[PDB]
Each structure stands twice: as structure tokens, then as C-alpha cells.
């Protein structure tokens, strides 16, 4: 068992050997390297077929129709596309948008740009557990509200929103609902034939597909529309121009198909390892759980260690690959939203599990955390204070 | 004729590239040597459905182009 | 020698076995799969190094500084970024933009969107050979002009513009000059330390790198600025947010390094094959050359065959993989700009050469074209007319 | 000391991520075991240049952080 131990599957995951192998068949002179936009020869046509086989693979995971799937360069793009695309298309119905103060930066930074463009954006504070108050969401909705973006699973604390119910509130009022499902896709079940989501973002590299590819769900029925953000020939049914990257696209679709298969088995296994982990450390004195144990992603666990200087916490767990969620001095904007102070936020670690994670690694982790938080506290002027 | 197709793909009201997408998917869930009646009103299908059979190696059986809806019978 | 014979390197090229092999070292659990944005562990840091080694490789091809190179998902994105980014940033100096009526769709469609946003765009007609009249360009420039986009090498006819001189005209007036160099990068020499280009686009898959990656040059000195189009965390020095796709990025940089090396040798070889090709067909009766023989890319040859029904021309050269440049019934918008009628434009073929192209393939091509244009004309009511 | 560096990287006026980029490139065109005086005024370099030496496995020699410009002597 090698070190570091990767516990940062939420930052990015490694590409499946099965995925990477497919992606090899679409690269070199003897593979299917042709441009799926060339239709005067065989090269293009068979490439386009590869694209279509993957577009379906993706669709089937989330109960969509392939004609509802738009190819992008990543979840970041899907979020820009979805939000600015919808906001611009529907701007005549009103200019008000609502989102959550704990959304990923792609959503937050996108909304802030729209605020420059003349849009009004309400950023709702979450409760201490991370869930949005639906009645606070309702009190925000107006006549001139046109769009709501609230993510399925949060990538820092793992907390799951009630996207079904939010979807119902949106539809009943004619408001477009966008959902960032980067973290939830292939982890929690998703069926858009039932869900009242209009736009949904997802990527590949959080599910053992390659970085640099992702997609955007756009509801066919009832019809949702968006303005393209990427111009030049009108590909993807006018919504995202540019050469389609076949291999990238193939790798993503294969990853989504494996995900459909292995999902159930895998998320019950991770959900167990997650519970193995929190139990071997929940007994330590000043440790808090950020998020929800029952109704949180099976693979994310974000815990706070109190009365320890956080700068050195990470230097103490160098045997682990994790993240605190801080930004090139200052501290997770999500934990600060949850309400914790800067010092506590700074000494929080997010453990994120995945395909290659074992019990051996979890147990080693459990041990390391006790002995580490133990040593730091020994030498902590802060702990001695608490020990009064 | 256009009487005993085992499969019937209605693609009316669909516009390029949607028809080739729908047809593409159908041939996959099809057994090699099967019939497929395509009903389209997308004029681009006069070029694109023969193009499919040509570049994807299928059997373009009987055609219709001289009036809407167009009909295209295809075999895998 | 297999068939079809690929003569569509300008649509897309196959990925170099050397490139694809590097891209393998950055995928799976045992490679460098880490997110170059994670800096709390080794995974991220070494990934970021890979990115930096490639960013430099790219820079050195075009005489830029690595700090001037911005990663994008493709040439299409670079063109959107460059044009809307510059136009929006400098809009207080004026709202007028100038480009050429034969630019790639990424540039044209982008300008048309800006026209919706309140920008004024002049689309200059080219001369019959494809070159822009610099004095017509000068007559268009105004006080309130802020940006000019004219491509280095055209992708349909291969014609090269005087980007140096255009750059001088721009600088002297404080106008931002953007250059689409997708076709020229690694084909003609480029040195931005000397050239007065402010923004320059390029991709990877036109130089034996992978589809789905590309970059944008942004001049450091004198300082040019743009508004980001892709929000979410402010990566690439605030100009293009989103996870960097390492393998994609590595494959591109390797492709740009091979290009620096092999360029000279290769473009003298292609320039010879190009001349082999036009000579074995220039003797046919009604054939015209679109573009320039002396001052055109070494690897593109676009020829028109008169008095032949074009629909069947391609069906006649099924042994070749080329393109006419038509759009899912109607005919190359570039050839129509050059001035040719729709029938002639329809029966034009663009032959584009590359790394895997031989003399055997060229000669076979020469032969096929004579015998083909011969048979079509035999059965052409149009030729019999011309034969009066 | 800060007297006999064989290489001198001026990074004044540069801001993260530019310093780590410049330093990154310099160590490549450097021979294993060479000195490099980094002159920076980017405060983020107090975290990032030690982070470089730590995660890229180089020798952080002598430091300066208590006043601008900061100085960082490094060895491959
Ligand atoms: C990682 C992540 C993204 C970013 O996706 P990219 O493919 O890296 O651009 C967006 N949203 C969420 C919730 C994420 O976790
Ligand atoms: C092919 C091409 C593009 C498109 O680049 P992509 O990477 O496919 O998005 C842009 N400009 C020119 C001139 C091209 O030839």
C-alpha cells in the first residue's frame, strides 16, 4: 500500500483502464481519428457514430434523451452555458436569478458576471447542515424570477439537496431550474424523465473519465431554450459550436456506462467505508462533522478538528492526499457559509472516497488522524487553553 | 413495398441532425437484416439517409422523395 | 497503399504516435492523473509541472512567453475568447470591428453575435486571389475602431495574409489585432517577439495533436487585456477558468515541439508534393486554381473543375478523402466570396497534404482526377455545351 | 549567504501564479546542484516557493520574508 493515499476523488479522479483503452481507438492514423463533421467520406461518418454511441451512454445514466445532451469542455463550461444561456434567452420574462451561497465557483463566478450585465442575483445562505430552507427559497421567488441554480451534491461537504422538490417549485411558476450534478452523477440516482430539472451540468473526470470533457442536459419537453455562448458553425444543434473531440467524448460515454452498471454496488461500499472512517475518528474529543451523515453523498466526509493550528494539520497528514478547500491563504468559502469561524474552517479536512479506496487505507487513515491530532494538540497553546 | 416493415421509425417534425441521430440509434437495437420504415419531413433526409446507408454500410431498399412525408425503407 | 486516401489534413489530422504516447503517461492511477489545481499534495504539483513544460513548448514555436499562453478547449474557443474578450474590454474606446468575409466560422459567427450586442462589424471582401486590399482595410479603419481580426492562413484555399503589415497598421493606431493562426501554426514561421499581433489563436488537431485542446496568445508587452468568457475560480491568470486537462495539454505541447523541429523539412516536402499535384492536373482543360501558387500554404490546393456537375464529382473521387467545403446543400462561402458562381464553387475540391502523404498517393491522385473528370465530362450535358 | 548565487532570477512586480512559473522554467535550464537567487515582492511566494522546493524536491537554502523584497536562495 503506497503513499500518499489519495483521498481527493472530489478534486479529480483517475481515468479507468477501461475508459483509457477505448480512448486509444480514436487517436492515431490507424484509429478512428476523422472529424465527425466531415460528411463527404467514411472517416467522418464512423467518427460521428462513435460520438452518438457515447451520447446515448450518457443519456441513459440520467434518464434523458440523447437529443437533450450537449457536449462541452467541462462542468465549468456547462455551468456558464446553462446559466448565461438561460438567463439571456429568458431575460424578457425578468432579470432575477437565485442560487446558493455554497455553489461551486463556476456557478458563483457566472452569476457575478451576470450581475455586471444587469441581472439581479439572490445568494441564499444555507443552514448549518448545508441544506437550503425551501421556504426561504420560496420567499425569494418573484414574478420576475427566471432561473434557479442549486446543485445536487456539494463538492466540499457532500450534502445533497432536494432537487426534486426544488424542481417542482420551479415548474409550478415557470422558472427555469438548473442543477449542478457534477458530484452526484453516477453516485446518486438521476432520472430526468421524472425530475423537473430543465438544465443539468456534469463532467467526466469526477467519475473516472478524462478531464477536459463534460456535457449539459437541456430539457426537450417541455422545451427549454438557451443562447449559445460558443459560436462558429452551430454544432450540437446550435448550442455549442466547435469540433467535437471524439476520443474525449468516447472516454466520457464509456465512463457513464460503467457508472450505470457499477453504481449501486459501489455507492453501498463507499457509504460503508465513509461510515468506517467517521466512526474511527468520531470519538476524538473536539471533532465536528460538516454536512449530513444520513443524507449526504456516500463518498464525501468533511470534518473539523478544533483547537489545532490548521496550517500544520495538512503538514501532519502528509501521508494523505486531501484538501482543506482553501484558496491560494484563506479558508473554504463553503465552511464559512455554514457558519464556522476562520480558524476552525482552516483546520478542516475533506476526505473523498472512490473506486480504488480500501479498508486498509481507511484504517491506516483512522490511525494516522488520532496520532496526528494527538501530537499537534500536545504542542498546541490552543489546546492547553481548552484543557484550561 | 412499404407494407411489411418490422420496424417503424416516425421522425416527422424532426430536423437535421435529429433524424440521422434517431436512425443511428434504431439500427443498433436492430438485428442485421431487418426492415425500418422512416417517416420524415426533413428535406435534408433526401441526402442524409442515403448517405447513412452508403457510409455506414446498410441496405437502402426503397425511397420516396417526390412528396411529403418522405418514406425510406432500410435494411441492416 | 490503402483507400480512401486521406487528403483532408485541414479538416483534422491524426495524432502523432509520439504525441499519443506522452498523453498516456497522464491518465490512469499509476500516471500523473492529479489535478494541477490541488496544491496540498504531490499529485497536483507534478501535474502542474507537466502543464508548464507544455505551455513552454507551445510558447517557443511562436516566439511568445509562456505567461502569454492561455489554455482553451480549441481554436473555436480562442476565437470567441479573443474577439469578444477584446471587444468587451476596449468598448469604451469605440464599438467598431473589422474582419474578412472569408474568415473561419468561429470568427464570423462571433462577430455576428457582437453585432447583436451593439458592435459594428465591417466584413471586407477579398480580391480574386483571396488577399485583402490593405488600402481598403485602411479606408475602413476609424477613430472608434478597436479590433481587427484577419487570419494568417485560410483553411479552404490556403492563402496567406500579410499579418506583419496588418499588425503594423493596427499598432500605429492603437487598434487590437487578432490573428487566427490555426492553419499557419507549425507551417509558416511565426515570431511574436517581432510581429505586431496582440492576440493569436491556435489549436492542436491541425498539427497532429488531439482534438479538444488549443490555446490563445495574449500579448504581455505592450500589455493587451481581455474579459474572460469562462468564469469559475479565475484560472489561467483570470482569463479562462476550469480544470486544466493535463493529458490534452501535454499532447498539444509535444505536438508543438515536434513541429518546431520538423517544420522546415516538412513544409519544403509538402510544398513540393503540392506542386507535383497541381502540375499533373493543371493541364486538364477547364481547371482553375483558387488562391495563390507562390504565396500560399505549402499543404493546401483548392482547384475548380468547370463544366462538370459537382454533386457527382465527389461520388467520382470516392477513392479520395477530401471536401468541397459545402454546408449540409450549398456551397463554400469562401469560394463564393472569391467571386465564383454557385455551380463552379460546388465542383471544387480542396486537397490538403500532411505528414503521412507520399508521392505514390499524389501520383495516384493525379491519375484518378484525369480519368474521373474525363468520364464525368463524357456524360455531361454541360461539357457538350462547352464543346459547342 | 546571499553573495555567490550562480543564477539570479528577478521576479519583482510579478504576481502568483507568475513567480512559480518563472522559477519552474529556470530550474529546468539549470544543472542539478545549482544556486538561484529569487527576488520577489509577491507575498504569496512566502508559501509557494517553499511549497515548490517541498513538492518538486529541491533544496530550500536560505530565506527572507521579514521585509521586501523577499529573497529565496534555492539549489537543485
Ligand atoms: C469539479 C466541479 C466542477 C468543475 O468541472 P470541470 O470539468 O473541472 O470544469 C463544477 N462543478 C462542480 C460541483 C464540481 O465539483
Ligand atoms: C479548424 C479551424 C478552427 C477550429 O478549431 P477547433 O479546435 O476545431 O475548435 C478555427 N479556425 C480555423 C482557421 C480552423 O481551420
Author numbering:
A (entry chain A), C (entry chain A): 1 to 328, 333 to 392
B (entry chain B), D (entry chain B): 4 to 79
Paper text:
The cysteine desulfurase IscS is a highly conserved master enzyme initiating sulfur transfer via persulfide to a range of acceptor proteins involved in Fe-S cluster assembly, tRNA modifications, and sulfur-containing cofactor biosynthesis. IscS is a highly conserved, widely distributed pyridoxal-5′-phosphate (PLP)-dependent enzyme, with 60% sequence identity between the enzyme from Escherichia coli and its human homolog, NFS1. It initiates intracellular sulfur trafficking, delivering the sulfur to several sulfur-accepting proteins such as IscU, ThiI, TusA, and MoaD/MoeB that commit the sulfur to different metabolic pathways, including iron-sulfur cluster assembly, thiamine and biotin synthesis, tRNA modifications, or molybdopterin biosynthesis. The small domain (residues 1–15 and 264–404) contains the critical active site cysteine Cys328.
